[PDB]
């Protein structure tokens, strides 16, 4: 096996290399671009905090979910449990180094001060 530069999670929708920009969440088996993260029936874009359903090809929003599955699906309960929905995860930049090379060569003590407010949102 020969090594490759970049990412191994290509966009199964547009068949393009997911690198540098990407800014997407990790899906079940296949990874897709943010711009490519649109509905298969409405072609609309999804936002963080909303629940999405992954169809045979692309993502299908709750707006056309019933009518879409009704035409290309039907009836049939065969398999091993199926009825879960996932929320669109926030984008995480691949450009982030988290290492401690300075504390491994030289040992130094430092004092840090942080202020916390504490409080949750309801409305
Ligand atoms: Zn793509
Ligand atoms: Zn839709």
What does this structure look like?
- The chain is largely without helices or strands.
- It has helices at residues 65-72, 102-105, and strands spanning 51-54, 59-60, 86-87.
- The chain has a 3-stranded antiparallel β-sheet, with no helix packed on it.
- β1 (51-54) and β2 (59-60) form a beta hairpin.
- Residues 39, 41-42, 44, 60-61, 63-64 line the site of one zinc ion.
- It is classed as transcription.
CATH topology: Cysteine Rich Protein
**Helical residue percent?**
under 10%
CATH homologous superfamily - what is it? Cysteine Rich Protein
Global outline: extended
Tally of contiguous helical segments: 2
Q: Indicate the CATH class.
A: Mainly Beta
Bound molecules: zinc ion
User: Given the helix and strand composition, which structural class is it?
Assistant: little secondary structure
CA distance, first residue to last residue: 54 Å
Using the 3D structure, state the CATH architecture.
Ribbon
Quote the beta fraction.
5-15%
Count of folded domains: 1
Assembly annotation: monomer
How would you spell out the order of helices and strands? EEHEH
The strand order across the widest sheet is 2-1-3
**Cα-atom radius of gyration:** 21 Å
Largest sheet: 3 strands, antiparallel
The total strand number stands at 3
PDB class: transcription
Keywords: LIM, Ldb1, transcription
Assembly: monomeric
Entry title: Backbone 1H, 13C, and 15N Chemical Shift Assignments for LMO2(LIM2)-Ldb1(LID)
